Structure 1
Amino acid sequence: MQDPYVKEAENLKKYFNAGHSDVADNGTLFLGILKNWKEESDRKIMQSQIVSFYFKLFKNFKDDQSIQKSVETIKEDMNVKFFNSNKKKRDDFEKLTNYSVTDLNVQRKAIDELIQVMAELGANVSGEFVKEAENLKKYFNDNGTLFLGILKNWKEESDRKIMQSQIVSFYFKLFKNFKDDQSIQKSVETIKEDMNVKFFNSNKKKRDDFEKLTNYSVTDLNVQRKAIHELIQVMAELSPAA
Protein backbone atom coordinates (compact mmCIF):
# COMPACT_ATOMS: atom_id res chain seq x y z
CA MET A 1 0.00 0.00 0.00
CA GLN A 2 1.53 3.19 -1.31
CA ASP A 3 1.58 6.64 0.25
CA PRO A 4 -0.32 9.13 -2.09
CA TYR A 5 2.62 11.59 -2.32
CA VAL A 6 4.73 8.96 -4.17
CA LYS A 7 2.82 9.11 -7.44
CA GLU A 8 3.07 12.93 -7.39
CA ALA A 9 6.83 12.80 -6.80
CA GLU A 10 7.14 10.42 -9.78
CA ASN A 11 5.22 13.06 -11.82
CA LEU A 12 7.78 15.69 -10.81
CA LYS A 13 10.61 13.32 -11.78
CA LYS A 14 9.23 13.03 -15.32
CA TYR A 15 8.79 16.82 -15.57
CA PHE A 16 12.41 17.49 -14.60
CA ASN A 17 13.81 14.48 -16.52
CA ALA A 18 15.28 13.29 -13.18
CA GLY A 19 14.95 9.65 -14.22
CA HIS A 20 17.84 10.13 -16.77
CA SER A 21 21.27 8.58 -15.98
CA ASP A 22 22.98 11.94 -16.19
CA VAL A 23 21.37 12.76 -12.87
CA ALA A 24 23.71 10.13 -11.21
CA ASP A 25 26.88 12.13 -11.90
CA ASN A 26 28.70 13.61 -8.90
CA GLY A 27 27.52 12.01 -5.58
CA THR A 28 24.41 12.89 -3.59
CA LEU A 29 22.92 16.16 -2.25
CA PHE A 30 20.91 14.93 0.73
CA LEU A 31 20.82 11.15 1.12
CA GLY A 32 24.31 10.39 2.29
CA ILE A 33 24.32 13.25 4.81
CA LEU A 34 21.06 12.03 6.36
CA LYS A 35 22.59 8.49 6.58
CA ASN A 36 25.33 9.84 8.88
CA TRP A 37 22.93 11.17 11.55
CA LYS A 38 20.85 8.88 13.69
CA GLU A 39 20.06 10.77 16.97
CA GLU A 40 16.90 12.80 16.60
CA SER A 41 18.39 16.25 17.41
CA ASP A 42 21.12 15.86 14.83
CA ARG A 43 18.61 14.69 12.22
CA LYS A 44 16.38 17.73 12.83
CA ILE A 45 19.11 20.32 12.23
CA MET A 46 20.00 18.66 8.85
CA GLN A 47 16.37 18.02 7.87
CA SER A 48 15.57 21.64 8.61
CA GLN A 49 18.02 22.83 5.89
CA ILE A 50 16.77 20.15 3.46
CA VAL A 51 13.12 21.20 3.90
CA SER A 52 13.83 24.92 3.34
CA PHE A 53 15.79 24.02 0.17
CA TYR A 54 12.77 22.11 -1.21
CA PHE A 55 10.45 24.99 -0.23
CA LYS A 56 12.59 27.53 -2.16
CA LEU A 57 12.66 25.17 -5.20
CA PHE A 58 8.87 24.60 -5.21
CA LYS A 59 8.26 28.38 -5.03
CA ASN A 60 9.98 28.72 -8.36
CA PHE A 61 7.54 26.12 -9.97
CA LYS A 62 4.22 26.13 -7.89
CA ASP A 63 2.13 27.24 -10.97
CA ASP A 64 3.76 25.19 -13.81
CA GLN A 65 0.93 23.66 -15.63
CA SER A 66 1.10 19.91 -15.33
CA ILE A 67 2.70 19.93 -11.86
CA GLN A 68 0.67 22.42 -9.80
CA LYS A 69 -1.36 19.64 -8.15
CA SER A 70 1.70 17.50 -7.52
CA VAL A 71 3.64 20.30 -5.79
CA GLU A 72 0.59 21.13 -3.62
CA THR A 73 0.24 17.49 -2.56
CA ILE A 74 3.93 17.10 -1.70
CA LYS A 75 4.11 20.34 0.31
CA GLU A 76 1.12 19.23 2.29
CA ASP A 77 2.66 15.81 3.02
CA MET A 78 5.92 17.56 4.20
CA ASN A 79 3.69 19.61 6.47
CA VAL A 80 2.18 16.52 8.00
CA LYS A 81 5.53 14.64 8.34
CA PHE A 82 7.92 17.46 9.39
CA PHE A 83 5.64 20.05 11.06
CA ASN A 84 2.98 17.66 12.40
CA SER A 85 0.36 19.80 10.63
CA ASN A 86 1.09 22.67 13.07
CA LYS A 87 0.34 25.91 11.19
CA LYS A 88 2.08 28.16 13.71
CA LYS A 89 5.27 25.97 13.57
CA ARG A 90 5.24 26.10 9.75
CA ASP A 91 4.68 29.92 9.85
CA ASP A 92 7.54 30.60 12.30
CA PHE A 93 9.82 28.48 10.09
CA GLU A 94 8.84 30.41 6.90
CA LYS A 95 9.44 33.80 8.68
CA LEU A 96 12.95 32.71 9.60
CA THR A 97 13.82 31.35 6.16
CA ASN A 98 12.80 34.63 4.53
CA TYR A 99 14.94 37.17 6.45
CA SER A 100 17.28 39.17 4.22
CA VAL A 101 20.85 39.24 5.45
CA THR A 102 21.54 42.40 3.40
CA ASP A 103 18.79 44.63 4.89
CA LEU A 104 20.66 46.87 7.36
CA ASN A 105 17.79 46.96 9.88
CA VAL A 106 17.60 43.17 9.82
CA GLN A 107 21.38 43.01 10.49
CA ARG A 108 21.10 45.42 13.36
CA LYS A 109 18.28 43.54 15.06
CA ALA A 110 20.30 40.30 14.55
CA ILE A 111 23.43 41.74 16.13
CA ASP A 112 21.30 43.20 18.94
CA GLU A 113 19.86 39.74 19.89
CA LEU A 114 23.08 37.73 19.57
CA ILE A 115 23.96 37.29 23.23
CA GLN A 116 20.39 36.22 24.14
CA VAL A 117 20.39 33.83 21.15
CA MET A 118 23.45 31.97 22.46
CA ALA A 119 21.68 31.71 25.74
CA GLU A 120 18.73 30.09 23.96
CA LEU A 121 21.17 27.62 22.31
CA GLY A 122 22.28 26.52 25.74
CA ALA A 123 25.65 28.29 25.70
CA ASN A 124 27.42 29.89 28.68
CA VAL A 125 29.31 32.74 26.97
CA SER A 126 32.87 33.84 27.97
CA GLY A 127 33.82 37.40 29.00
CA GLU A 128 35.65 37.55 25.68
CA PHE A 129 32.56 36.60 23.65
CA VAL A 130 30.64 39.48 25.30
CA LYS A 131 33.16 42.14 24.35
CA GLU A 132 33.49 41.11 20.71
CA ALA A 133 29.69 41.27 20.49
CA GLU A 134 29.65 44.90 21.74
CA ASN A 135 32.11 45.83 18.98
CA LEU A 136 29.51 44.62 16.43
CA LYS A 137 26.62 46.35 18.22
CA LYS A 138 28.63 49.61 17.81
CA TYR A 139 29.56 49.14 14.16
CA PHE A 140 25.94 48.33 13.09
CA ASN A 141 24.38 50.74 15.61
CA ASP A 142 11.11 48.41 17.48
CA ASN A 143 8.76 46.38 19.67
CA GLY A 144 9.47 43.30 17.55
CA THR A 145 12.36 40.84 17.65
CA LEU A 146 13.89 38.80 14.86
CA PHE A 147 14.57 35.58 16.72
CA LEU A 148 13.74 35.80 20.43
CA GLY A 149 9.98 35.70 20.21
CA ILE A 150 9.99 32.69 17.87
CA LEU A 151 12.35 30.83 20.21
CA LYS A 152 10.04 31.56 23.14
CA ASN A 153 7.13 29.85 21.28
CA TRP A 154 8.62 26.32 21.26
CA LYS A 155 9.69 24.23 24.24
CA GLU A 156 10.11 20.68 22.94
CA GLU A 157 13.66 20.01 21.86
CA SER A 158 12.92 18.82 18.31
CA ASP A 159 10.82 21.93 17.58
CA ARG A 160 13.69 24.05 18.99
CA LYS A 161 16.31 22.39 16.78
CA ILE A 162 14.20 23.01 13.66
CA MET A 163 14.19 26.77 14.40
CA GLN A 164 17.74 27.00 15.75
CA SER A 165 19.01 25.45 12.49
CA GLN A 166 17.57 28.37 10.50
CA ILE A 167 18.95 31.01 13.00
CA VAL A 168 22.53 29.57 12.97
CA SER A 169 22.56 29.39 9.18
CA PHE A 170 21.37 33.07 8.96
CA TYR A 171 24.24 34.18 11.23
CA PHE A 172 26.84 32.08 9.35
CA LYS A 173 25.75 33.89 6.17
CA LEU A 174 25.82 37.34 7.85
CA PHE A 175 29.35 36.56 9.10
CA LYS A 176 30.50 35.40 5.62
CA ASN A 177 29.47 38.74 4.12
CA PHE A 178 31.56 40.62 6.74
CA LYS A 179 34.36 38.08 7.29
CA ASP A 180 37.02 40.45 5.99
CA ASP A 181 35.83 43.86 7.09
CA GLN A 182 38.67 45.91 8.72
CA SER A 183 37.10 47.22 11.99
CA ILE A 184 34.98 44.22 12.96
CA GLN A 185 37.02 41.42 11.36
CA LYS A 186 38.28 39.95 14.65
CA SER A 187 34.91 40.23 16.37
CA VAL A 188 33.17 38.26 13.58
CA GLU A 189 35.85 35.54 13.77
CA THR A 190 35.56 35.18 17.55
CA ILE A 191 31.78 34.83 17.78
CA LYS A 192 31.67 32.65 14.67
CA GLU A 193 33.80 29.97 16.36
CA ASP A 194 32.04 29.73 19.76
CA MET A 195 28.71 29.47 17.91
CA ASN A 196 30.21 26.51 15.92
CA VAL A 197 31.58 24.86 19.05
CA LYS A 198 28.24 24.88 20.86
CA PHE A 199 25.77 24.12 18.08
CA PHE A 200 27.77 21.28 16.61
CA ASN A 201 28.92 20.08 20.06
CA SER A 202 32.56 19.88 18.93
CA ASN A 203 31.91 17.50 16.04
CA LYS A 204 33.79 18.47 12.89
CA LYS A 205 31.88 15.91 10.88
CA LYS A 206 28.53 17.43 11.89
CA ARG A 207 29.88 20.90 11.17
CA ASP A 208 31.04 19.97 7.70
CA ASP A 209 27.79 18.20 6.73
CA PHE A 210 25.98 21.34 7.77
CA GLU A 211 28.11 23.67 5.62
CA LYS A 212 27.72 21.35 2.61
CA LEU A 213 23.90 21.59 2.94
CA THR A 214 24.06 25.28 3.43
CA ASN A 215 26.16 25.94 0.29
CA TYR A 216 24.19 24.31 -2.57
CA SER A 217 22.55 26.73 -5.04
CA VAL A 218 19.00 25.66 -5.87
CA THR A 219 19.48 27.76 -9.00
CA ASP A 220 21.84 25.40 -10.96
CA LEU A 221 19.72 23.04 -13.11
CA ASN A 222 21.78 19.98 -12.19
CA VAL A 223 21.37 20.53 -8.43
CA GLN A 224 17.65 21.02 -8.91
CA ARG A 225 17.43 17.77 -10.91
CA LYS A 226 19.31 15.80 -8.19
CA ALA A 227 17.01 17.33 -5.51
CA ILE A 228 13.98 16.14 -7.42
CA HIS A 229 15.50 12.67 -7.95
CA GLU A 230 16.13 12.28 -4.16
CA LEU A 231 12.69 13.55 -3.02
CA ILE A 232 10.90 10.23 -2.46
CA GLN A 233 13.70 8.80 -0.26
CA VAL A 234 14.07 12.11 1.62
CA MET A 235 10.31 12.11 2.40
CA ALA A 236 10.48 8.55 3.66
CA GLU A 237 12.88 9.64 6.40
CA LEU A 238 11.32 12.98 7.43
CA SER A 239 9.02 11.64 10.16
CA PRO A 240 10.18 11.29 13.81
CA ALA A 241 12.56 8.38 14.46
CA ALA A 242 11.89 5.33 16.68
Structure 2
Amino acid sequence: QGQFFREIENLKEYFNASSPDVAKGGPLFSEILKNWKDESDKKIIQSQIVSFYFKLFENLKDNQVIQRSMDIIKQDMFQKFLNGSSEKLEDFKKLIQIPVDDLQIQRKAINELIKVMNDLS
Protein backbone atom coordinates (compact mmCIF):
# COMPACT_ATOMS: atom_id res chain seq x y z
CA GLN A 1 0.00 0.00 0.00
CA GLY A 2 2.85 2.43 0.85
CA GLN A 3 5.55 0.52 -1.08
CA PHE A 4 3.07 0.25 -3.97
CA PHE A 5 2.18 3.94 -4.17
CA ARG A 6 5.89 4.85 -3.95
CA GLU A 7 6.58 2.53 -6.89
CA ILE A 8 3.87 3.85 -9.17
CA GLU A 9 5.16 7.37 -8.51
CA ASN A 10 8.69 6.22 -9.35
CA LEU A 11 7.36 4.92 -12.73
CA LYS A 12 5.24 8.09 -13.32
CA GLU A 13 8.37 10.14 -12.74
CA TYR A 14 10.55 8.10 -15.13
CA PHE A 15 8.04 8.26 -17.98
CA ASN A 16 6.70 11.78 -17.16
CA ALA A 17 3.20 10.26 -16.84
CA SER A 18 1.46 12.70 -14.48
CA SER A 19 1.54 15.57 -17.02
CA PRO A 20 -1.54 16.78 -18.99
CA ASP A 21 0.01 15.75 -22.32
CA VAL A 22 -0.90 12.18 -21.29
CA ALA A 23 -4.71 12.51 -21.23
CA LYS A 24 -4.24 13.63 -24.86
CA GLY A 25 -5.61 10.91 -27.11
CA GLY A 26 -8.23 9.10 -25.03
CA PRO A 27 -8.10 6.40 -22.33
CA LEU A 28 -6.13 3.23 -22.80
CA PHE A 29 -7.72 0.93 -20.27
CA SER A 30 -9.93 3.11 -18.02
CA GLU A 31 -12.96 3.12 -20.27
CA ILE A 32 -12.84 -0.66 -20.81
CA LEU A 33 -12.37 -1.21 -17.06
CA LYS A 34 -15.69 0.61 -16.45
CA ASN A 35 -17.51 -1.29 -19.21
CA TRP A 36 -16.60 -4.55 -17.44
CA LYS A 37 -16.61 -3.44 -13.80
CA ASP A 38 -19.49 -5.77 -12.88
CA GLU A 39 -19.15 -8.36 -15.68
CA SER A 40 -18.85 -11.92 -14.40
CA ASP A 41 -16.30 -12.59 -17.17
CA LYS A 42 -14.07 -9.50 -16.55
CA LYS A 43 -10.99 -11.74 -16.13
CA ILE A 44 -11.06 -12.01 -19.94
CA ILE A 45 -10.26 -8.29 -20.12
CA GLN A 46 -8.03 -8.21 -17.04
CA SER A 47 -5.94 -10.96 -18.61
CA GLN A 48 -5.16 -8.75 -21.63
CA ILE A 49 -4.43 -5.73 -19.44
CA VAL A 50 -2.14 -7.70 -17.13
CA SER A 51 -0.31 -9.32 -20.06
CA PHE A 52 0.26 -5.87 -21.52
CA TYR A 53 2.05 -4.70 -18.32
CA PHE A 54 4.10 -7.86 -18.15
CA LYS A 55 5.26 -7.42 -21.72
CA LEU A 56 5.93 -3.72 -21.16
CA PHE A 57 7.95 -4.36 -18.04
CA GLU A 58 9.81 -7.21 -19.69
CA ASN A 59 11.03 -4.91 -22.41
CA LEU A 60 12.02 -2.16 -19.98
CA LYS A 61 13.84 -4.78 -17.86
CA ASP A 62 17.25 -3.08 -18.21
CA ASN A 63 16.23 0.39 -16.99
CA GLN A 64 17.94 0.17 -13.61
CA VAL A 65 15.98 3.15 -12.30
CA ILE A 66 12.61 1.42 -12.54
CA GLN A 67 13.60 -2.23 -12.32
CA ARG A 68 12.53 -2.70 -8.71
CA SER A 69 9.31 -0.68 -9.26
CA MET A 70 8.36 -3.08 -12.03
CA ASP A 71 9.31 -6.09 -9.86
CA ILE A 72 7.09 -4.81 -7.04
CA ILE A 73 4.11 -3.97 -9.26
CA LYS A 74 4.46 -7.34 -11.06
CA GLN A 75 4.64 -9.31 -7.79
CA ASP A 76 1.47 -7.54 -6.69
CA MET A 77 -0.37 -8.33 -9.93
CA PHE A 78 0.74 -11.91 -9.45
CA GLN A 79 -0.69 -12.09 -5.93
CA LYS A 80 -4.02 -10.45 -6.74
CA PHE A 81 -4.70 -11.76 -10.24
CA LEU A 82 -3.00 -15.14 -10.26
CA ASN A 83 -3.57 -15.90 -6.51
CA GLY A 84 0.17 -16.12 -5.92
CA SER A 85 0.09 -19.45 -7.79
CA SER A 86 3.54 -19.95 -9.23
CA GLU A 87 2.36 -22.64 -11.69
CA LYS A 88 -0.30 -20.24 -13.00
CA LEU A 89 2.37 -17.58 -13.43
CA GLU A 90 4.67 -19.85 -15.44
CA ASP A 91 1.70 -20.68 -17.75
CA PHE A 92 0.67 -17.05 -18.08
CA LYS A 93 4.22 -15.96 -18.92
CA LYS A 94 4.58 -18.70 -21.47
CA LEU A 95 1.35 -17.78 -23.24
CA ILE A 96 1.99 -14.02 -23.45
CA GLN A 97 5.40 -14.55 -25.00
CA ILE A 98 4.29 -16.72 -27.94
CA PRO A 99 5.11 -15.21 -31.37
CA VAL A 100 2.45 -15.28 -34.11
CA ASP A 101 4.93 -15.03 -36.97
CA ASP A 102 6.83 -18.27 -36.36
CA LEU A 103 5.78 -21.06 -38.79
CA GLN A 104 6.63 -23.97 -36.48
CA ILE A 105 4.46 -22.30 -33.81
CA GLN A 106 1.62 -21.66 -36.32
CA ARG A 107 1.49 -25.37 -37.19
CA LYS A 108 1.35 -26.42 -33.56
CA ALA A 109 -1.46 -23.93 -32.94
CA ILE A 110 -3.47 -25.16 -35.90
CA ASN A 111 -2.68 -28.68 -34.83
CA GLU A 112 -4.15 -28.03 -31.37
CA LEU A 113 -7.26 -26.17 -32.45
CA ILE A 114 -9.60 -29.08 -31.78
CA LYS A 115 -8.46 -29.27 -28.18
CA VAL A 116 -8.71 -25.47 -27.81
CA MET A 117 -12.21 -25.33 -29.26
CA ASN A 118 -13.49 -28.13 -26.95
CA ASP A 119 -12.24 -26.23 -23.91
CA LEU A 120 -14.18 -23.18 -25.01
CA SER A 121 -17.37 -25.25 -25.49
* TM-score, normalised via structure 1 length: 0.45
Corresponding residue for residue 8 of structure 2: 133
Counterpart Cα distance in 2 of 1:127 and 1:157: 30
1:207 aligns with 2:82: no
Deviations 1:11-64 (A, max 9, x none): xxxxxxxxxxxxxxxxxxxxxxxxxxxxxxxxxxxxxxxxxxxxxxxxxxxxxx
**Is 1:132–1:190's contact at 8 Å kept on the other side of the alignment?**
yes
Q: How does 1:30-179 map to 2 (within 5 A)?
A: 126-141=1-16, 142=23, 144-154=26-36, 155-158=38-41, 160-179=42-61
Corresponding residue for residue 70 of structure 2: 188
Deviations 1:89-122 (A, max 9, x none): xxxxxxxxxxxxxxxxxxxxxxxxxxxxxxxxxx
Counterpart Cα distance in 2 of 1:225 and 1:151: 34
Aligned-residue offset at 1:131: 0.4
Code of the residue aligned with 1:215 in structure 2: it is: Q
Corresponding residue for residue 234 of structure 1: 116
Deviations 1:148-207 (A, max 9, x none): 11011122221x111000000000011111122122222122111111111100111111
**Which sections of structure 2, spanning at least 5 residues, go unmatched?**
17-22
Counterpart Cα distance in 2 of 1:233 and 1:134: 44
Corresponding residue for residue 23 of structure 1: none
**Is 2:55–2:96's contact at 8 Å kept on the other side of the alignment?**
no
Code of the residue aligned with 1:163 in structure 2: it is: I
Corresponding residue for residue 13 of structure 1: none
The runs of 4+ residues in structure 1 deviating greater than 2 Å are none
Aligned-residue offset at 1:224: 0.3
RMSD: 1.3
* TM-score, normalised via structure 2 length: 0.86
Counterpart Cα distance in 1 of 2:77 and 2:10: 17
Counterpart Cα distance in 1 of 2:30 and 2:10: 21
Corresponding residue for residue 63 of structure 1: none
SS class of match (1:179): coil
Greater Rg by CA: 1
Corresponding residue for residue 224 of structure 1: 106
Code of the residue aligned with 2:35 in structure 1: it is: N
**Which sections of structure 1, spanning at least 5 residues, go unmatched?**
1-125
Whose helix proportion is higher, 1 or 2? 1
Identity level (%): 59
**Is 1:179–1:189's contact at 8 Å kept on the other side of the alignment?**
no
